Amino acid sequence: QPQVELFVKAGSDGAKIGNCPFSQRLFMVLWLKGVTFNVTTVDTKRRTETVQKLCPGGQLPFLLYGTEVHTDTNKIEEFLEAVLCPPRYPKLAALNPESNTAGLDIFAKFSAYIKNSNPALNDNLEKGLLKALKVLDNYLTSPLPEEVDEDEGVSQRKFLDGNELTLADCNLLPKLHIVQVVCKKYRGFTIPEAFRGVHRYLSNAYAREEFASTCPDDEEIELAYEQVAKALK
Known about the structure:
membrane, chloride channel, CLIC-1_C, EC 1.8.-.-, phosphoprotein, monomer, four-stranded mixed beta sheet
């Protein structure tokens, strides 16, 4: 009911949505809440008077909820999940605490792999990324408490916590998107088909407009990584 406006980082043209997994995460949350909201891209190099008055500190993303400004993605998400409550808006929080931690090291192992310029560490950092993807794949093929005794021993649910998207998917999918896009372009690296749980996860995720329509363009994600990703000769 109070106006909800999400301020995200602008891409290469200073206008369109830029590479930012925290901006896409909140976008996915506001989408799954069913609330009315706008998104305003911010070019950090050419900040409008409006933005400098609203958020003098410069933090992005930030949220205007009515007249109050919220900073820090995790705090913004906690705020949105508490205030947009049933029956008008769905609870998005996962039931199973492990849904919130599965694959949460993937992004850090990716960052080390893609920022690495030492040819001698490429293999090691690849195995590190593969291992973390594997831990996720185990979680995704582990049956959840709701699947209790119902391909014996294998989960076939769609997302981290069940067949509905949760806050947990909102945090992980934007990061997994970047990993896929950036490793294809710059390392000829691809999530092995053997990780059947992870490929089923992503196929369900790309099918849902909440993920697919909140993704920045491949071209933006690749430009954001070109400097660090090419340092590896």
